[PDB]
Structures are given as structure tokens and as C-alpha cells.
Amino acid sequence: MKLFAQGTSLDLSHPHVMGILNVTPNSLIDAVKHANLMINAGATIIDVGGESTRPGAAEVSVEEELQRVIPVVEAIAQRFEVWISVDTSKPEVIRESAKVGAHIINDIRSLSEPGALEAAAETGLPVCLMHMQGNPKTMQEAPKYDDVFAEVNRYFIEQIARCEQAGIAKEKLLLDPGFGFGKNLSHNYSLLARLAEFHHFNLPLLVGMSRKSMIGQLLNVGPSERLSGSLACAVIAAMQGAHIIRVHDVKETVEAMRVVEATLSAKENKRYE
Amino acid sequence: SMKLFAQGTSLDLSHPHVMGILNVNSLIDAVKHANLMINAGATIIDVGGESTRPGAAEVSVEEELQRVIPVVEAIAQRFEVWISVDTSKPEVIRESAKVGAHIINDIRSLSEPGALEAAAETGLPVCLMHMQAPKYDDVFAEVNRYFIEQIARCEQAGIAKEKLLLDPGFGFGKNLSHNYSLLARLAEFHHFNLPLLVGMSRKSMIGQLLNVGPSERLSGSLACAVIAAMQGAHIIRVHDVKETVEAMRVVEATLSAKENKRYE
Ligand SMILES: Nc1nc2[nH]c(SCCc3ccc(S(N)(=O)=O)cc3)nc2c(=O)[nH]1
Ligand SMILES: Nc1nc2[nH]c(SCCc3ccc(S(N)(=O)=O)cc3)nc2c(=O)[nH]1
């Protein structure tokens, strides 16, 4: 499995670490400093995000998101070789990001915004499709599923079809179950436990559990006390064949991923189920 | 519903347990460290540490008794935690059981003269660990047959199968490649229907892979624990108790949401 963007490629034979770079409030200088630290710790992708999608988050104007994101993507692409994912839902941010060197469109809304689908297609870039029930304002009010795995699985079927009809080929797509995006604790763990079953689509799998409440509520610790839990989640995912792990704590995750790599390379079938 | 019995209590092996490592004036600090490990969530304390590492200075019978017995006694009197004892000597096995030890953890699988008979007499649970530039045809198959052999040897000496734990012995006569081969296939050892104990914490199988110092292996050690626990390993022996317990809670939440209750 490989992805292609901006005249390079990304080999998904071994799990990759994606470092989180939030640029919600010198801002540009600190951002590039942080990216650099994450690159040196072994991150091969940086996820640049200028809109909070935490539960209850307020929307951000397109002009504000552009000012936060585009100088940061540009500065990174002009200095390093690391891949760059842009965590946005806005057509214009999608276009302007691709023009300045971004490689992956990581949309938590799966291109649901008006014109987002068409803009993503126009770039040619890889696209991550994430599951969310509802929207960030209300997704955590009362998450409810008869069968969460089935409903997330059905959602991916539907959204894959949707991207194909718009002219985005399967080979550009990634899937992400959306941990924390309209799920209670038990819903998140049902998805993590059956994650390997999403491989049937034959598409890269991306997960983002780092420091989220599925660790906090389970351990009864705050956000700065969740490293061990976060690593445990990362390893559980990567052992089931997840290709990209989105994290805050890059060095430590990269170390854990080596151990997973060694273990999978010693295994016959190269996955746990 | 696997359980072990010792000293009038039981250990419920339906979820993974963290066994903290204790290094053996002494006694006050030992009880202090035991207390910290219990507070961090260890349910078993392994008594020995640096004093009992392979390569360490061999000691006389009377020295090992003087060093080990009062620590086991003091822990048994003050806490409800289970106590694993690191020893190869029959006298120490015997006297440890008298003062409250729950598990005999002999890396030599009771090979020294009298050790097997002394272990049998105590009625306590016994860990069967595999030990030996290393070399194997099929390291899994060699470890497997070693277990078949020790189970029969123990059963010969009157030790019920219900008291045995199996440990593949990470880092004992094994290069990096052999170690990862055993971890990768750890789940296959469940055919014995016996508890599985593993100890990878801070070992060379991490140190060599990541190329870092003894004190910088927490993340790889946690990865190892999680990999083992996801395959149904019952006891994980570690230095970093708090962090390992947190990781094990995540594994337990994952395994409770799974139909199989194990990854293979
Ligand atoms: N592909 C992908 N992209 C992502 N972007 C984000 S931003 C996280 C917003 C947030 C924070 C905290 C909680 S909570 N209540 O669970 O702790 C939920 C959402 N996440 C993901 C993710 O997973 N995948
Ligand atoms: N049941 C059980 N008991 C144990 N006791 C020990 S003591 C540690 C000795 C050591 C240190 C370092 C390396 S190395 N060269 O791989 O880094 C090997 C052995 N370990 C274990 C274990 O695993 N199980």
C-alpha cells in the first residue's frame, strides 16, 4: 500500500506516526519549532489543524482558518520533507493548502461541507474519511447506536461510494473510525476491539485516540496523565494493522511502533485478530 | 475462569495482573517500596530484584534466608498482595512458604538438588521458565517441548497441573530475533490451558531495537506488555508498575468488548 502526493510517496508497509500540530490560539515561529521537534522524534506526517472539533467547539470563519493554517503548511513544506496533512472541512482551505504543498486532506466531516467534495477531487490529493455521529457541537450529548461497528461500517460503504461518484478513486482514500466523535466509552472500545475487521475495504486505516476521554474516563486521570493509556491504544491499533496513528507524544509512540514492527515482522500472517 | 490458590487466598486470572519487582534498614525501605507498588496497582510483588539477577554474586543458604525471609514475612504481615519469591534453593523455598509466599519463581525451573521436592512440599504455585550467541531450529517448538517436559517432571514429583505457570523466559538464551518470534506466537502457548507469565521489562529485546539506555525503555516495555496482554498473558512482570497497570486497563476494556476475549 502506498499514497502519492506532491511528487513523493508514502509506504504503508509499516505503521506511521502522525504528529498533531494545532494552530488554534509568534504563532508561525512556534509552529515550525514544534513540527521540527516532531520530525526529529520520528513523525513522518504532521497534521495541521486550525479549527477545533472538540465536543462543543465553535465554528471558525474561513478567513481565520486560512490565516492560521496556510502560512504553517507553507513554512513546513519549504523547510522539511515530512508529509503534511491538513485537518479541515473548508473547500478554500483544501485548495490553498494543496497549492502550498499539503499531501493529505484529513477531513473529520468526510467532505460534507458544500463544495468540499469537489475541491478535494480537484487537488488530486489523498483523502481521509472519518466517522462522526452528528457534528462537534452536539455529537457527545447522547451518542446512540444499535450496533456501533455495523453503523460505522455502513457509513464507510456510503462515503466510499460518494467519493467515487465525485471522481475520487479508492486508491486515494483512508478510513478512520473517529474515536471520540459521537461515541461513549463502550462505543469507542467496541470499535478498537474490532478494528482489524475494517481491513476488508482494503484501504489504509488511520486512528486518533491520543489523550482522548476514552483513556481519561477509563483511568480517571486528566489530559496530561494519559501517555501510558495513549500508547496502549496505539499498540492495540497498530497490532491490528492500522497504518497511521495520530498522536501528541511522538517519540514515545514511534518507540512503541518499532516494537510492534519487530513483532509483526516475526509473525507469519502479519496481523492480530 | 483461571485461578491460583495459595496461603488461604486466590488470584483471579480473568484479567491481566501486574507483578512489580522489588530489590532486596533494608526492611523498612522494602516495605516502603512494596507499599508504593501496591498503591500503583501491582497485585503481585516479586521479591529479589538486583540481588537475584543472573550474573549477581551467588550467596550462601544462610545469607539468602537472612535477606529474603524477613522481607516476605514483613510484606505478608502488612499487606494482602501476593508475593512471588525469586529463589533456586530448597531451604529458601521451604522457609518462604512458612512465612507467607504465594508463588515460587525459580528461573531454573527447580533444577538445583532438592528444589523440586521442596516446591512440591509447599503446595504453592510454581513458575516454569525457559532458559538455556544463542541458537534454535524453531525457538517456539523448543520452548513448547520444554514446557511439555517440565509439566510432566512436576506432575511426576506430585505437583498438580493446576499449580503451574508457564513463562517463555524473554532474554534468557535468546537473541532479539528469537525473543520477537516468541512474543509474536505467545497466544499459541494457551493450548496447555495454563497461566502465562512474561517478563520483558527494560530488557535487551527493547534496548537493542530502540538503541537506548536501561532507563529509557518505558515506551518499548509498555508496548511489549500490551502485545503480551492482548494475547491473553495473565501476569506481566515489570519495573514500572503505575504505567503498566494503566496500559493493562486499556487492554482489559478492549478485551471485554471483544467476542473472542483474546488476539491471535
Ligand atoms: N483522522 C482523524 N483526525 C482527527 N482530528 C481530530 S481533532 C480531536 C477533537 C477531539 C478532541 C477530544 C475528543 S474526546 N471527548 O474524546 O476526548 C474528541 C474529539 N481527531 C481525529 C481523529 O481521530 N482522526
Ligand atoms: N518469571 C520470570 N522471572 C524473571 N526474573 C527475571 S530477572 C532479569 C534478568 C535478565 C536481565 C536482562 C536480560 S537481557 N540480556 O535480555 O537484557 C536477561 C535477563 N526475568 C524474569 C522473567 O522474564 N520471568
| Cβ–Cβ gap B183/A263 under 8 Å | yes
- CATH number of residue B101's parent domain: 3.20.20.20
Q: Give me B19's grid cell.
A: 507483578
**What's the structural domain count of chain B?**
1
In degrees rounded to 5, what are phi and psi of residue B52? -110, 0
User: Using CA atoms, how far apart are residues A97 and B179, in angstroms rounded to an integer?
Assistant: 45
User: Using CA atoms, how far apart are residues B261 and A214, in angstroms rounded to an integer?
Assistant: 19
Q: Measuring CA to CA, how many Å separate A46 from each of A24, A51, A206, B161?
A: 15, 15, 13, 53
Closest chain A residue to B260, measured at CA: A273
Which residues of A fall within a CB distance of 8 Å from B258?
193-194
User: Using CA atoms, how far apart are residues A84 and A72, in angstroms rounded to an integer?
Assistant: 10
Closest chain A residue to B225, measured at CA: A232
Among candidates A148, A133, A223, which has minimal Cα distance to A192? Answer: A148
The greatest distance separating any two alpha carbons of chain A, rounded to the nearest whole angstrom, comes to 51
Contact B87, B97 (CB under 8 A): no
Residues of B with CB under 8 A from a CB of A: 176-177, 180-181, 183-185, 206, 209-210, 212, 218-220, 222-224, 226-227, 230-231, 242-244, 246-251, 253-258, 263-264
User: Using CA atoms, how far apart are residues A125 and A120, in angstroms rounded to an integer?
Assistant: 7
Residues pairing with B129 in the sheet: B167
| Cβ–Cβ gap A240/B249 under 8 Å | no
Ligand 2 pocket test, pick from B19, B46, B87, B107 with the greatest ligand atom count within 8 Å of Cβ, gives B107
Q: Measuring CA to CA, how many Å separate B189 from each of B83, B145, B193?
A: 24, 11, 8
User: Using CA atoms, how far apart are residues A46 and A25, in angstroms rounded to an integer?
Assistant: 18
In terms of C-beta density within 10 A (0-12 exposed, 13-18 middle, 19 or more buried), how is residue A25 classed?
exposed
Span from the CA of B196 to the centroid of ligand 1 (angstroms) = 36
Q: How many CB atoms lie within 10 A of CB B25?
A: 5
Closest chain B residue to A266, measured at CA: B181
Q: Measuring CA to CA, how many Å separate A145 from each of A140, A142, B223?
A: 13, 10, 31
Known active-site residue B258: no
User: Using CA atoms, how far apart are residues B84 and B201, in angstroms rounded to an integer?
Assistant: 17
| Cβ–Cβ gap A189/B227 under 8 Å | no
Cβ-Cβ contacts under 8 Å for A155 (sequence gap 6 or more): A131
Which residues of A fall within a CB distance of 8 Å from B219?
231, 251-253, 255-256
Given A162, A212, A267, A270, which residue is catalytic? Answer: A212
Crossing angle for the helix pair A116-123 and A91-99, to the nearest 10 degrees: 10
User: Using CA atoms, how far apart are residues A47 and B3, in angstroms rounded to an integer?
Assistant: 46
- A224 SS3 class: helix
Given B203, B217, B242, B249, which residue is catalytic? Answer: B203
Known active-site residue A246: yes
Residue A106 annotated as binding site:
yes
User: Using CA atoms, how far apart are residues A134 and B36, in angstroms rounded to an integer?
Assistant: 45
Element (H, E) at A129: strand A127-130
Q: How was this structure determined?
A: X-ray
Atom of ligand 2 nearest to the CA of B204: 17
Half-sphere exposure of A164 (CA within 13 A, CB side): 8
Element (H, E) at A48: strand A45-49
Instruction: Please give the radius of gyration of chain A, using alpha carbons only, rounded to the nearest integer.
Output: 17
Contact A215, A233 (CB under 8 A): yes
Strand-strand pairing, B126-129 and B103-106: parallel
**SS (HEC) of chain B:** CCEEEECCEEEECCCCEEEEEEECCHHHHHHHHHHHHHHHCCCEEEEEHHHHCCCCCCCCHHHHHHHHHHHHHHHHHHCCCEEEEECCCHHHHHHHHHCCCCEEEECCCCCCCCHHHHHHHHCCCEEEECCCCCCCCCHHHHHHHHHHHHHHHHHHCCCCHHHEEEECCCCCCCCHHHHHHHHHCHHHHHHHCCCEEECCCCCHHHHHHHCCCHHHCHHHHHHHHHHHHHCCCCEEEECCHHHHHHHHHHHHHHHHCCCCCCCC
**SS (HEC) of B89-119:** CHHHHHHHHHCCCCEEEECCCCCCCCHHHHH
Helices (H), A86-184: 91-99, 116-123, 148-165
Residue identifier of the C-alpha nearest atom 2 of ligand 2? B199
Handedness of CA A195, B206, B199, B136 (dihedral sign): positive
User: Using CA atoms, how far apart are residues A190 and B258, in angstroms rounded to an integer?
Assistant: 7
User: Using CA atoms, how far apart are residues B128 and B146, in angstroms rounded to an integer?
Assistant: 9
Contact B55, B25 (CB under 8 A): no
User: Using CA atoms, how far apart are residues B183 and A235, in angstroms rounded to an integer?
Assistant: 14
In terms of C-beta density within 10 A (0-12 exposed, 13-18 middle, 19 or more buried), how is residue A221 classed?
middle
Half-sphere exposure of B110 (CA within 13 A, CB side): 32
Q: How many CB atoms lie within 10 A of CB B3?
A: 11
**Resolution of the experimentally solved model in angstroms:** 2.0
Handedness of CA B199, B203, B204, B210 (dihedral sign): positive
Strand-strand pairing, B235-238 and B197-198: parallel
User: Using CA atoms, how far apart are residues B25 and B155, in angstroms rounded to an integer?
Assistant: 41
CB distance A174 to ligand 1 below 6 Å: no
What is the residue range of A255's domain?
Answer: 1-273
Contact B93, B87 (CB under 8 A): yes
Q: Give me A232's grid cell.
A: 496502549
In terms of C-beta density within 10 A (0-12 exposed, 13-18 middle, 19 or more buried), how is residue A213 classed?
middle
User: Using CA atoms, how far apart are residues A101 and A118, in angstroms rounded to an integer?
Assistant: 19
